[PDB]
Design a protein around this ligand. Structure first.
Ligand SMILES: Nc1ncnc2c1ncn2[C@@H]1O[C@H](COP(=O)(O)OS(=O)(=O)O)[C@@H](O)[C@H]1O
Ligand SMILES: Nc1ncnc2c1ncn2[C@@H]1O[C@H](COP(=O)(O)OS(=O)(=O)O)[C@@H](O)[C@H]1O
Ligand SMILES: Nc1ncnc2c1ncn2[C@@H]1O[C@H](COP(=O)(O)OS(=O)(=O)O)[C@@H](O)[C@H]1O
Ligand SMILES: Nc1ncnc2c1ncn2[C@@H]1O[C@H](COP(=O)(O)OS(=O)(=O)O)[C@@H](O)[C@H]1O
Ligand SMILES: [Mg+2]
Lengths: 200, 193
């Protein structure tokens, strides 16, 4: 017996109030990829760039989320489904609020990344899937603690070893972090945000 | 990026004002009414905010929860964690959930205060008979007809706050009277200029 309550404030007014030299630019930048591939690195520099150009944003990192909102979830397929589902719902509120939301979660199931997109596109919010792509071995020698414990059978169902990572087929962007610079990665994301009319 | 750097790019006129106004009270007490009219004020005055309403949130993030003691605990736990992210992002976050249990509201507080973010517990306080009279959604009559079990105030409990930052007597005040009480507490804590 739950029935929806409408807001009094439109997106257009929100974009007037949040962003200086306004225009509503609420969206979500969804980073996806193996552990140690470069998602958090890339998302924190993107957040830095954005704040330095007067564009309000927040970063939701799986690791951070997973000690607060999702502290009660593990790494079974079903928990990762629910991990991703909740954060898709959270990110949708941030883009609806007027902010560029940046997420950095492994998010290893295509079905779940597509659901996250539909949550946004349904609500007429732009959703940018960015594949952060570093070869497994590169991600592994970058590690500290986890890959080692996982090869020893102390972390069961670890993405890339024991559990599969499902690659996006045709994302908005692929970031080759083994051959690409941190600033260069960030610039590519900005270039995308330029065309897609988020950054002036 | 630091909170200080956020407050110079988020605000329409500078200074970090991230915080959570947390409304608690009976069904029909006036939570949604106040929060949305409060959301209207803050926006028209150049202050970015966002309302998280228990009914809307239960359509999305919290759609896999019902009204058991434990589910109400999880409902409130999740939105407290979300509200601390909006706060930390520099927005004034307005939540309006029944949040019937004092243990869970104190937990939502601790979540915030342990991140050094302001938390204002606002008791929206109309007695049951008043809320029942209004019965805006037909829920009280349905509850008393035996069509809804464990309804707050009838077959489950509401636990009143012990040290709220603000009580609003919606039975003796009008919407705007109530909105202004809120703003003046916000003025007091340098959230609103
Ligand atoms: N272009 C790049 N992008 C991201 N990380 C890089 C890059 N080049 C080198 N690195 C290194 O790779 C590591 C990236 O790890 P994280 O950002 O922590 O990965 S994450 O995907 O699990 O979030 C950092 O230690 C960083 O110094
Ligand atoms: N079994 C595991 N698989 C992958 N990551 C794990 C596992 N156990 C712990 N972790 C830690 O959790 C982080 C990833 O969490 P998420 O991005 O939240 O995962 S996701 O698959 O559900 O999206 C990793 O970077 C790693 O530090
Ligand atoms: N001062 C007041 N503040 C808020 N609501 C009031 C006030 N006076 C009367 N009301 C009325 O009481 C009803 C409260 O219902 P809701 O706002 O929907 O309450 S809620 O707590 O269940 O969210 C509304 O129809 C509202 O117009
Ligand atoms: N058994 C019930 N008790 C109270 N509210 C209910 C119940 N069933 C449906 N509702 C509806 O759901 C709303 C309560 O949602 P919340 O604010 O999210 O409650 S809370 O107790 O878990 O915080 C009420 O406004 C009412 O519309
Ligand atoms: Mg309500």
């Amino acid at each position: 017996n739950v029935t929806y309550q409408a807001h009094h404030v439109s997106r257009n007014k929100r974009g007037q109030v949040v962003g200086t030299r306004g225009g509503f630019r609420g969206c979500t930048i969804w980073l996806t990829g193996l552990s140690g591939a470069g998602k958090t690195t890339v998302s924190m520099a993107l957040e830095e760039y954005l704040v330095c150009h007067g564009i309000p944003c927040y970063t939701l990192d799986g690791d951070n989320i997973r000690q607060g909102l999702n502290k009660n979830l593990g790494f079974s397929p079903e928990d990762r489904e629910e991990n991703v589902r909740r954060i898709a719902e959270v990110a949708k509120l941030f883009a609806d609020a007027g902010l560029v939301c940046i997420t950095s979660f492994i998010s290893p199931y295509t079905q779940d990344r597509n659901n996250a997109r539909q949550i946004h596109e349904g609500a007429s919010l732009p959703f940018f899937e960015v594949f952060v792509d570093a070869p497994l071995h590169v991600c592994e020698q970058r590690d500290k603690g986890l890959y080692k414990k996982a090869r020893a059978g102390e972390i069961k169902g670890f993405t890339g070893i024991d559990s599969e990572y499902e690659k996006p087929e045709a994302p908005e962007l692929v970031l080759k972090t083994d051959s690409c610079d941190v600033n260069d990665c960030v610039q590519q994301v900005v270039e995308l945000l330029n065309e897609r009319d988020i950054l002036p």
